[PDB]
A paper describes a structure:
Human polynucleotide phosphorylase (hPNPase), a trimeric exoribonuclease, is crucial for maintaining mitochondrial RNA metabolism, including the regulated degradation of RNA. In all forms of life, PNPase catalyzes the phosphorolytic degradation of RNA, utilizing inorganic phosphate as a nucleophile to cleave the RNA phosphodiester bonds and release small RNA fragments with a 5′-diphosphate and a 3′-hydroxyl group. Three identical subunits assemble into a barrel-shaped trimer with a channel forming a central pore in hPNPase. Each subunit contains two RNase PH-like domains (PH1 and PH2) alongside the K homology (KH) and S1 domains.
To understand the structural basis of hPNPase-mediated RNA degradation in human mitochondria, we determined the structure of hPNPase bound to a phosphate ion in its active site to an overall resolution of 2.4 Å using single-particle cryo-EM. The phosphate ion is present in each protomer and coordinated by S482-484, H450, and R446, located in the PH2 domain. In contrast, our cryo-EM reconstruction of hPNPaseapo shows that the pore is occluded by loops extending from the PH1 (residues 104–124) and PH2 (residues 405–423) domains, which are oriented toward the center of the pore and restrict the available space. For the hPNPaseapo, we observe three distinct asymmetric assemblies of PH1 (residues 104–124) and PH2 (residues 405–423) domain loop conformations throughout 3D classification, henceforth called hPNPaseapo-loop-conf, hPNPaseapo-loop-conf, and hPNPaseapo-loop-conf. Only hPNPaseapo-loop-conf1and the hPNPaseload allow a neighboring protomer’s PH1 loop to adopt an α-helical structure extending toward the active site. This enables interactions between Y116/R119 (chain B) with L443/N444 (chain C), facilitating R445 to form a stable salt bridge with D101 (chain C), thereby stabilizing the active site. Importantly, this stabilization may be necessary as hPNPaseapo orients R446 toward the phosphate binding site, a conformation incompatible with RNA binding due to steric clashes. Active site stabilization and N444 repositioning may allow for the upward reorientation of R446, facilitating efficient RNA entry. Steric constraints limit this rearrangement; only one active site can be stabilized by a neighboring protomer’s PH1 domain loop to prevent steric clashes.
Numbering used by the authors:
A (entry chain B), B (entry chain A): 46 to 669
C (entry chain C): 46 to 668
């Protein structure tokens, strides 16, 4: 039992009492909130040639707060914010696993108790760090996680629920030993860059205090790590031979600036087929997968050597050069708002829909105290269809990535959404083509569609993703020199070291999500990434402003119409029908929804004026 | 961009703007309704031994200007209107793929915008044809699709929603080049055969104009088809050796009229086990699947040659003979209505249940999944349990075929269902045994169970399936000769060319679904099939009328009751409970349904008099 | 075709009319309720290397066939009441399949008609027996099943729905020929042990009459059984050889009382891996599964020989001794009630949550009917996370076992739950570690957490699982001798003959579920198990009473409260908002629920007193 003091807060870490069967287990308590995290890793290598790691964060201690009816129904009971928390924990611990650790691993977080004051999400990240540190699962170094808020100008570590309601910043920092950064997740209320950077500095300092506390617990316990029967990394002598066979062929492909996404991939795969052939007879005893990963190591190394040595990219861009950006608005007449944003070979179509404020809400499956009500009556739905990458996939449900990307784009656009808007705003972003940051293009395209729909947003929001290529020595593991890339392609994200997605208006920052694939990066690189992204964001906003610079003076004339109709007490029963039958039928046949305002007035909402006059005669016949 | 004038309608076809990574893509716009269809096909052969083709038509709510109304504010699950549209598109495009194209293929439809006037389902069929035509996927000639309705005695091409509500016919025709027919899907208000037949030729004439426009677009934008890695068809020399090995044994099996479904299958499989083992010895280097497919081709060729050369079928019937038909009603006392319909070895049990009117409108927002309404308060649920074929399979969820068969049998019976029936009519049809058209037996047994239940349907409805065996010219590809079969078995559907399911009253046609396996058939074959099924339908109605010829004068004594109760204002609070809690508790432990029709009076629906007795007991004791 | 008379009740069994394509089909009718059951078994050996058997009891309507629900199955799925019936049917027919019958098999139930009087669940068990009896599937003698209830002191066979509502016992007995018991599943209102044992005697007598009727129907029909392509049982030559290489090593492992669950399994695996290589060399033609299965048979027989010959379990205790029991309550300040029950290496954490009574109903007429309404506003939720056994598994949703264990533990605690409690009571049992009866530990821990939470239960409830090791000669199958084990581990459950779970207070029995793996056991063995478990249950209640002996004087001061607020007619519209937006906005902000009770009265339920302060701020702000 170790206590770590974080300012006025206290973090208690325990182990050895609950779930002694699991490979690692820990209980993290802050105030009267306790989170229990376990880690399990199979000793038999998985058939798949990657690291299968699943993180699941649940609130099963309340039985989901209700009684879901069926097994299939239970596949939806998992809350949205529980999926988002699992994604944050996953990105905090994934980079620290050893390379070639192809073993099925599961990290489970169980909310023992919640006091409604201390947020359990930050405790879950620390619990995952302690559980892996105390387990025999090889995992490099503990990580500490804190949430930084800005309340009336002060910087608060791990703010309570009440403090978060008055904070202009919601930043979560995961830090590795010697002040490295492994995860960043922020949601700011259009705050200045300097204020944002200072909060990262304060947060990283606090995570180091957690790391030394966890390190004290590890020494007291006496953790011993397992020896995996095989770490699946290509032997250096086969990688070296692959380098000889494909160095020049791969270099020519990557220095050819005429390639597009498909042409470059076909060119690389054409080399892969030729090299993987001769590699087989030279090394007959090599594993079939080992040959594939040997080529992927060489192709990645050649790709990184070009940008490091020559300060040029595979499509001829310089380090700070954007892709071609084109925008359109109002492409379909019947949509309330529409925009088509293209960034290189990434294409996103954004739609805006309006609805009643009281629409939704009456859903009965409120497993928590969670219903259709959002903070500003604003939500963003993100969809990534399989044809965006010329792929085949089922369209049943939203996977974790689509739900995570939608929340990120929603965070980016949230601070500029107005209050007291008469309608519920829903923005739908559909990725038609994907070669880059469709997540950030949903913020730019969503911004354009919001102005095109006539929503009076305070400012336009643009996002961009910053990549990173580093040179790291094998004797120390320190970063010697590095390059930051503006508006990375898909191959630069795949062969890079991070996907630093950051969005905001022309004067401030609204959202950030850093997905670092390295085992930590210095704070210096993070500060420069925010600055480099600031210049790119201004350039994107200038292109967007040419297409549309301000919201339209009014909504489209073919949009929703809201007004009241009177029904006296005498004719109330016939109008609503037996048990509200007539109103329910009207909502079924036509989209018109009728709600009771006062004892004698009903508010009629019609999604289109065409659907309005259709239901106008329906209430006329009822009124007889 | 190509424009097609379909009478007073307009069709706009475009490509090359949206979703450029997909193998094929197209946008089809009529009026203000736009649909985007993409087609993706893998270049690597599928592990399965067939063509996996999936069509997923999505009715996204953003296109219609509505926000999903559950607590997640996002659409969950698949609606039954989307499944039916996916089946029509699948029926229109599947026959045109080359034989042996064992590659994973997905066609996706995205509703860009809908104006509430032009129906997007027909546009999605044309969009799938354009996307496949412009892609590199090997696909035969373009397909044009139109909807024909009869409004005030006039034929209208692609009627709007307003005209579709007043039409007596809803026919969808998909045509191939040279006026062939690849898909027919109609529901009619018991219209005459002549009027139905004229609409098919009017529709086919319009689909040729669409094909003309699509071919112009294909010419303008160059299309080069891919060369598949290989086409999985059995070698002609291997097939000819199988014929010399099993033609005589297979001929004896199919001329043995004492067989039933199971014994004939055992006899055929007995020949297959002897022949395939000899085939492996003769062709050791042949593909294991090539052996299986070569026998299937030889068995199909022998089976069809008997019908063509001798006009006699495998069970001894001639081309127009029905199977044995047996009907029975009043199976169980507690059922509101029931019927057991036997057609050869196909056995169907149909049940009628009278539900409350309120349960008909499940469209209310309470559903976390999707739900809607039915025009008349009539619906049919069709079950195909695994034991109907003596096999083991999943029984819970998501069987598109069950949904398609239920919708077909439902629209067959819909025209005769009375209006203003005081209850919701739910018909459940379970296939206890299947050796043929259980979907049409569901229509026959559904009408028997409806008359037995006491529903005053206007006329009895019977359905039948018409098969087809053709002798196609090997080179030219036209039909040299053909035979039409009445009331086909399962084997004649599987080894045939079409499953022409058509139902109707003795004086008209109510439903039609033609499942053509050929790459198009002439209109003269369709016309003869409709006439041949007219003769069979009268014969079936003659047998069914012997069991029961008119609806029973009243519903069964154990049927549902509706009557109102009176509660005073003082006892209203105790009766209803806090937030209507005591009401929801009463209808959950009794099965009744209580609705408030006035301040003082409540209406009570009970499925049985015993259920009403218990509810009456609770009402009086709560009132005192 | 055959009629079986059970007292004042009648059972009509028929076949040969419906679903003639299935391998076996039967219709069982009692009164005006008819159930059709089919049985299909593939002739191709499945690659699963075990017996794939799935039973799907599907009903067409809820509320005793009064609210249709079958059309919703594509979107909603299968209700839990259908899963529980499918498990009862599965337990009755699974042990009678021959060993090595590795063929995919499905039993499907179709409620052709229900009258709202006779329960179709009992008919489905009989129908599954008749369908398998008339089929060509190799399956042992017919199984009869009845339900026994106690109404005003008398014993009633197959009681109607009205009778079951006034019964103090709900016992389902599935009997094999020669008065063997195959399945036992009961829930009682804390009835005496003597009354419980007599009902089992009455039930087995009735199941023998049903078996006579089925045997008559089989003879008339003329059933001939298929010959399966192969029966996957290890050859005696290789089973004997495995006994030669691994008997002494396995004997030492099972006589080492210093082992725990993990270490004992590792030691057996060490012998197994060493034995597999020797077996493969000695029998190169042997199938890979045959090598594996021979070791499992030899290890199982060595394990049982120690209990039979030496009367000592693998962890050193005698046949009656319990494992170490440790209880702990009130571990987290914010939980309404909590308890951590430890029994050997099994650890369960139980939590009590008070919710509003309004949360009981789903407010959708059909969906509320599907899952029903818990009678005392009490439910138990059982979770078996994958880390409880140091494995990785799917997390969302509950498997069949989790639903069954939750229903069993809720039945055990139901009789002591008080009536007219102001709040809905939800108990969550989470298995942190598993080495034995976590389902019965959920009953003990749930009782501790309920007294800790301040719920005035009538008495504490404890459960236990009784094992069985028998020695039967292969010729006849009768039981020469047997040992009954108290509080079995996982290895003794796995290598044993039954998992006899029974729970109750110190003066009665509230729940029972017997999972017999033999093809029936004598009734005298069952009666000894009940008595032996009553002594063990006494020892557990003595330990639990030391931790907490009576419910706390009142609920925790941070628990939920319910109070009323008066809003006038003039302020009603503003308070609720147009379309009830304000009430649901307050619910989404603070978690409180406001329900209108009269014209002026609104009842507010708040999870915490602080949450009610936030709600009260809104109420006065509007007014």
């Amino acid at each position: 039992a170790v206590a770590v003091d974080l300012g006025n807060r206290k973090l208690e870490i325990s182990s050895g009492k609950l779930a002694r069967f699991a490979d690692g287990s820990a209980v993290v308590q802050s105030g009267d909130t306790a989170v229990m995290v376990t880690a399990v890793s199979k000793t038999k290598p998985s058939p798949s040639q990657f690291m299968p790691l699943v993180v699941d964060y649940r609130q099963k201690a309340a039985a989901a707060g209700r009684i879901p009816t069926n097994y299939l129904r239970r596949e939806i009971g998992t809350s949205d914010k529980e999926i988002l928390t699992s994604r944050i924990i996953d990105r905090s611990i994934r980079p620290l696993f050893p390379a070639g650790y192809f073993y099925d691993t599961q990290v489970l977080c169980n909310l023992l108790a919640v006091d409604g004051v201390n947020e359990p999400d930050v405790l879950a990240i620390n619990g995952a760090s302690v559980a892996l540190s105390l387990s025999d699962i090889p995992w490099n170094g503990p990580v500490g996680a804190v949430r930084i808020g800005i309340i009336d100008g002060e910087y608060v570590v791990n703010p309570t629920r009440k403090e978060m309601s008055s904070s202009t910043l919601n930043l979560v920092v995961a830090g590795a030993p010697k002040s490295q950064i492994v995860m960043l997740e922020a949601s700011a209320e259009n705050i200045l860059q300097q204020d944002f950077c200072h909060a990262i500095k304060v947060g990283v300092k606090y995570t180091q205090q957690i790391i030394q506390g966890i390190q004290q617990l590890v020494k007291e316990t006496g953790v011993t790590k397992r020896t995996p029967q095989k770490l699946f990394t290509p032997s250096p002598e086969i990688v070296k031979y692959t380098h000889k066979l494909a160095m020049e062929r791969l270099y020519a492909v990557f220095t050819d600036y005429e390639h597009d996404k498909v042409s470059r991939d076909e060119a690389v795969n054409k080399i892969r087929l030729d090299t993987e052939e001769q590699l087989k007879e030279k090394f007959p005893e090599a594993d079939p997968y080992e040959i594939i990963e040997s080529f992927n190591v060489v192709a990645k190394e050649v790709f990184r050597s070009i940008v490091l040595n020559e300060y040029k990219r595979c499509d001829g861009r310089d380090l700070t050069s954007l892709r071609n950006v084109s925008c359109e608005v109002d492409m379909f007449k019947t949509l309330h708002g529409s925009a088509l944003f293209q960034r290189g070979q990434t294409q996103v179509l954004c739609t805006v829909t309006f609805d009643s404020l009281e629409s939704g809400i009456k859903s009965d499956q409120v497993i928590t105290a969670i219903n259709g009500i959002k903070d500003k009556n604003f939500m963003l739905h993100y969809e990534f269809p399989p044809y965006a990458t010329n792929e085949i996939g089922k369209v049943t449900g939203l996977n974790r990535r689509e739900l995570g990307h939608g929340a990120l784009a929603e965070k980016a656009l949230y601070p500029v959404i107005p209050r007291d808007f008469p309608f519920t705003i829903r923005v739908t972003s559909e990725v038609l083509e994907s070669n880059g940051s469709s997540s950030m293009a949903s913020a730019c395209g969503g911004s354009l569609a919001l102005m095109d729909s006539g929503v009076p947003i305070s400012s336009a929001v643009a996002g961009v993703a910053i990549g990173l290529v580093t040179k790291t020595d094998p004797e120390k593991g320190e970063i010697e020199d590095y390059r930051l890339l503006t508006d990375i392609l898909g191959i630069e994200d795949y062969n890079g070291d991070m996907d630093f997605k950051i969005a905001g208006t022309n004067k401030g920052i609204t959202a950030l999500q850093a997905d670092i694939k390295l085992p930590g990066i210095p704070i210096k690189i993070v500060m420069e990434a925010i600055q480099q992204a600031s210049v790119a964001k201004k350039e994107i906003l200038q292109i967007m402003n040419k297409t549309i610079s301000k919201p339209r003076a009014s909504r489209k004339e073919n949009g929703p119409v809201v007004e009241t109709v009177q029904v006296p007490l005498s004719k109330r029963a016939k109008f609503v029908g037996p048990g509200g039958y007539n109103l329910k039928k009207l909502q079924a046949e036509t989209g018109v929804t009728i709600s009771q305002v006062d004892e004698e007035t009903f508010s009629v909402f019609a999604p289109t004026p065409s659907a309005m006059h259709e239901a106008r005669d329906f209430i006329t016949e009822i009124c007889k």
